[PDB]
Amino acid sequence: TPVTLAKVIKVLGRTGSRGGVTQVRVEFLEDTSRTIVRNVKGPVRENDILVLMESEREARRLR
Amino acid sequence: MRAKWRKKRTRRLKRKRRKVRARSK
Amino acid sequence: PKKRASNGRNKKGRGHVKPVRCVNCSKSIPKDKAIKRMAIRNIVEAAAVRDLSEASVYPEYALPKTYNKLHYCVSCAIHARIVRVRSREDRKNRAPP
Amino acid sequence: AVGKNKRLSKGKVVDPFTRKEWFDIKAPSTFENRNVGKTLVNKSTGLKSASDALKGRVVEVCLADLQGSEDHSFRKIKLRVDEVQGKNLLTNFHGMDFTTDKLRSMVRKWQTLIEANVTVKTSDDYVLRIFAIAFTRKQANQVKRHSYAQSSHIRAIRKVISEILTKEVQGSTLAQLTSKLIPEVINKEIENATKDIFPLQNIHVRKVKLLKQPKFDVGALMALHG
Amino acid sequence: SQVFGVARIYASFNDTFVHVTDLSGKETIARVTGGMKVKADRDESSPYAAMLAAQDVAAKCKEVGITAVHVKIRATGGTRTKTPGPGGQAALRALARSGLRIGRIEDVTPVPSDSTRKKGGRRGRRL
RNA sequence: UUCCUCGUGGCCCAAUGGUCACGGCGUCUGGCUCGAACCAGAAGAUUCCAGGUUCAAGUCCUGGCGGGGAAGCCA
RNA sequence: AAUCCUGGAUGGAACGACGAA
RNA sequence: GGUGAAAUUCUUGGAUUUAUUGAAGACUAACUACUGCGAAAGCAUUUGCCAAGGACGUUUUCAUUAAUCAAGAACGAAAGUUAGGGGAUCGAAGAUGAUCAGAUACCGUCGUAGUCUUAACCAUAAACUAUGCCGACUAGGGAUCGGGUGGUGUUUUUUUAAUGACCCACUCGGCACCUUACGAGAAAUCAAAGUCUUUGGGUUCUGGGGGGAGUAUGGUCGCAAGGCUGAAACUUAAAGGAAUUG
Ligand SMILES: [Mg+2]
Ligand SMILES: [Mg+2]
Ligand SMILES: [Mg+2]
Ligand SMILES: [Mg+2]
Ligand SMILES: [Mg+2]
Ligand SMILES: [Mg+2]
Ligand SMILES: [Mg+2]
Ligand SMILES: [Mg+2]
Ligand SMILES: [Mg+2]
Ligand SMILES: [Mg+2]
Ligand SMILES: [Mg+2]
Ligand SMILES: [Mg+2]
Ligand SMILES: [Mg+2]
Ligand SMILES: [Mg+2]
Ligand SMILES: [Mg+2]
Ligand SMILES: [Mg+2]
Ligand SMILES: [Mg+2]
């Protein structure tokens, strides 16, 4: 039953056609020095914490 | 209509008329 | 009327240029009316390079690069958020950004 | 995609990595390192004799891995298996070739590319197709932005190059040629012969390929592996 | 110290192949695709599928005896795209993160000297 | 004339003797939108007519009604 | 006083309207 | 596999994939650009042969031999035709899978003719710079291709020479380009589309509202496909070009 905690360090922007998604670059609490970009469904701040059911995935960054 | 296809129609009708006239000639 | 003096292209003294194919829609477009870009990129990305260097024997290595030249037709280049569309006065601007 | 197959079988487990064995690869002595890696085969049955299934194998590996230096980092070498003596299988030179990254890095626009290729045979009765490549350069004090040649310079350069390779191969057997290749003396000769004609940067040679080999002559092979 | 293999990612659109061999290429290990790790026909190409494939081949190589791997990334090439698909770099990152070691990545997309002819017509694949 | 076959909702068509009977189109109602197309949904059958077998016939059997097909040869 | 670096995409369906002014 | 998504299709007889070779035929990437040559069409791997050509240079030669040209002749993309060859890719037709109200269309998978060549026909094209050729003159500016001249200019050789490659200045000729309008133009725009009511340098071709109609007929060429030539009846008040604001 593994899950990964990740701390938010930077909110990038909203995403999704209807704006109910947010891109965030996080910092893994355990195994620090690792930063990954993820989608989020709800509201989010910097320094919030996320429970990744899987860590080995990042979203297509909107650039 | 498109002039290209109108031309194609004239060409077909010319062919038609040419052979239906060869029927007599 | 005449939208462009070059008419779309770079054919002055040639007659014929022996076209190429759009890599997106396989359309036979002349090599001069096309739009040539060059996608010079690192092979992996900005992200996983750190993981690769961590997991790499042969340190200091290179991270070599992938170079591919791209031709697009007008329609595909305009659909793919490239040369899109400009005003009558800025059409004459011939340099890149 | 998984449960899609209509039929797996037209008409209607034994995992093999227990059935296999490892060998380690020895390169010739014209290389500061011999131990290339390892390979696999099935166990030598009586109806197979795995030696012969493994005889005609080819393995491409980097010259920087054979020499240690990352200066020869592009420069892949293909090695052909020719003999086996108890799990330390020997190889001989099959052919060189560059990496696409380096080649495309050379190929930039607003400079003229020159290419040559010759079909020469050696002292050891081999036949090789040696490829040479070169590129114009923009001199210092130069203001115009392309540095193209006048297309007879190119023909002269190519004549010179082809004559040099036909001269330098005839006399080099195969290992003599390999040890001429590795230090990149040929490129120095091309530059010294063409500086009187045109600048010529990036005179790395190019891939070389065998076409037809002589008879085996195991003695000449074992001469290399000491 | 390190036992080397060769990974041979072929990352097209519509699918992704991770399949690893000895240095010679004649003897192979652990060919798995994206469509073996997903059931759509629409996500055969995707990075998650490629990542799962790379995890599987990492497991199989490690239980064979292979520790490091060289990489040859490839697209459909020829007359076709020549730009690699989405799931190549994902597989690469995945087999790196799984515990294997890397050496000498290369791109080996087959390129022609103006070979035969692309498909679609001269007017193209319209849509 | 003989032989063979067919008949089912407005149209085409299917049915194991075992529910006043399946489907598609059409029709009616509502919705999206003015109409189509689309989405939801309804209703409509004396299974050609007269008899018989059976607990029960659309079906199984006899007769007629109408439609079609094949045959009508040696001279 | 230490100190190696980056930029980047596509993605279904959608017929029609009397003329006059 | 392919796709927007699927399906047709191939796969325990091992498909896709890997490596090693071999064959076939086509093509000639990246270099490849507001660059070159060519009468145009058009022409891009190497080397060899064959003949030709432009520009440049010239204190060489003839000496008006010239410019444009109904007739008439040569070349003339692709498709197409005939006959052989070759026939890998792609692929009018056709067959199929889907999409769709229908889809003998777009998309997908196959796939004949064709795509390549030889010998011979065709004789067309948005064959377009939609701009006839020859000639003279008229504003600035720089870049570039080829040739040539000059410079104690830079670099390499053998510090050094001659070369070659670069730099600067200039020049003839060419593909073009930028800026302005003294000018022109209906304007868009044009260093030619200027020097044209202050109307004439020379010459060839074509057009006369829109349709009917590049039609019918008659000739002529062509194996054919068709080409070149080419009306009338009847019909109509607008068709059209360039810009303007919506
Ligand atoms: Mg043309
Ligand atoms: Mg209704
Ligand atoms: Mg209607
Ligand atoms: Mg109508
Ligand atoms: Mg196989
Ligand atoms: Mg080439
Ligand atoms: Mg040139
Ligand atoms: Mg014409
Ligand atoms: Mg014209
Ligand atoms: Mg003039
Ligand atoms: Mg000059
Ligand atoms: Mg000039
Ligand atoms: Mg020119
Ligand atoms: Mg008139
Ligand atoms: Mg008229
Ligand atoms: Mg009126
Ligand atoms: Mg208008």
PDB file of N, CA and C (backbone and C1' of nucleotides) and ligand atoms in Angstrom, chain H residues 143-146 172-175, ligand 12:
ATOM      1  P     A H 143      27.949  46.275 -49.413  1.00  0.00           P
ATOM      2  O5'   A H 143      27.049  44.973 -49.581  1.00  0.00           O
ATOM      3  C5'   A H 143      26.642  44.239 -48.441  1.00  0.00           C
ATOM      4  C4'   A H 143      25.700  43.114 -48.786  1.00  0.00           C
ATOM      5  C3'   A H 143      26.230  42.036 -49.710  1.00  0.00           C
ATOM      6  O3'   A H 143      27.104  41.117 -49.087  1.00  0.00           O
ATOM      7  C1'   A H 143      24.059  42.626 -50.375  1.00  0.00           C
ATOM      8  P     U H 144      28.316  40.478 -49.926  1.00  0.00           P
ATOM      9  O5'   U H 144      27.604  39.569 -51.015  1.00  0.00           O
ATOM     10  C5'   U H 144      26.755  38.511 -50.616  1.00  0.00           C
ATOM     11  C4'   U H 144      26.002  37.915 -51.775  1.00  0.00           C
ATOM     12  C3'   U H 144      26.840  37.335 -52.897  1.00  0.00           C
ATOM     13  O3'   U H 144      27.337  36.041 -52.616  1.00  0.00           O
ATOM     14  C1'   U H 144      25.109  38.658 -53.802  1.00  0.00           C
ATOM     15  P     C H 145      28.623  35.487 -53.396  1.00  0.00           P
ATOM     16  O5'   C H 145      28.090  35.212 -54.867  1.00  0.00           O
ATOM     17  C5'   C H 145      27.257  34.097 -55.129  1.00  0.00           C
ATOM     18  C4'   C H 145      27.136  33.807 -56.601  1.00  0.00           C
ATOM     19  C3'   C H 145      28.409  33.898 -57.409  1.00  0.00           C
ATOM     20  O3'   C H 145      29.252  32.777 -57.269  1.00  0.00           O
ATOM     21  C1'   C H 145      26.707  35.033 -58.547  1.00  0.00           C
ATOM     22  P     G H 146      30.836  32.968 -57.395  1.00  0.00           P
ATOM     23  O5'   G H 146      31.040  33.360 -58.917  1.00  0.00           O
ATOM     24  C5'   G H 146      30.680  32.434 -59.918  1.00  0.00           C
ATOM     25  C4'   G H 146      30.869  32.963 -61.310  1.00  0.00           C
ATOM     26  C3'   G H 146      32.163  33.693 -61.591  1.00  0.00           C
ATOM     27  O3'   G H 146      33.283  32.846 -61.734  1.00  0.00           O
ATOM     28  C1'   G H 146      30.388  34.903 -62.515  1.00  0.00           C
ATOM     29  P     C H 172      30.176  49.581 -64.779  1.00  0.00           P
ATOM     30  O5'   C H 172      30.079  48.293 -65.695  1.00  0.00           O
ATOM     31  C5'   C H 172      30.724  48.287 -66.950  1.00  0.00           C
ATOM     32  C4'   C H 172      30.713  46.931 -67.603  1.00  0.00           C
ATOM     33  C3'   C H 172      29.413  46.169 -67.546  1.00  0.00           C
ATOM     34  O3'   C H 172      28.450  46.616 -68.475  1.00  0.00           O
ATOM     35  C1'   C H 172      31.164  44.730 -66.958  1.00  0.00           C
ATOM     36  P     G H 173      26.903  46.631 -68.064  1.00  0.00           P
ATOM     37  O5'   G H 173      26.544  45.094 -67.967  1.00  0.00           O
ATOM     38  C5'   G H 173      26.775  44.257 -69.081  1.00  0.00           C
ATOM     39  C4'   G H 173      26.617  42.805 -68.747  1.00  0.00           C
ATOM     40  C3'   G H 173      25.380  42.440 -67.973  1.00  0.00           C
ATOM     41  O3'   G H 173      24.203  42.428 -68.743  1.00  0.00           O
ATOM     42  C1'   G H 173      27.211  41.363 -67.015  1.00  0.00           C
ATOM     43  P     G H 174      22.804  42.306 -67.987  1.00  0.00           P
ATOM     44  O5'   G H 174      22.904  40.877 -67.320  1.00  0.00           O
ATOM     45  C5'   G H 174      21.793  40.022 -67.310  1.00  0.00           C
ATOM     46  C4'   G H 174      21.945  38.936 -66.291  1.00  0.00           C
ATOM     47  C3'   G H 174      20.934  38.955 -65.170  1.00  0.00           C
ATOM     48  O3'   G H 174      19.665  38.491 -65.576  1.00  0.00           O
ATOM     49  C1'   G H 174      23.079  38.529 -64.297  1.00  0.00           C
ATOM     50  P     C H 175      18.335  39.158 -64.984  1.00  0.00           P
ATOM     51  O5'   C H 175      18.080  38.302 -63.679  1.00  0.00           O
ATOM     52  C5'   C H 175      18.227  36.896 -63.731  1.00  0.00           C
ATOM     53  C4'   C H 175      18.041  36.251 -62.392  1.00  0.00           C
ATOM     54  C3'   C H 175      17.019  36.879 -61.474  1.00  0.00           C
ATOM     55  O3'   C H 175      15.690  36.556 -61.834  1.00  0.00           O
ATOM     56  C1'   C H 175      18.966  36.352 -60.258  1.00  0.00           C
TER      57        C H 175
HETATM   58 MG    MG I  12      26.386  43.170 -59.565  1.00  0.00          MG
END
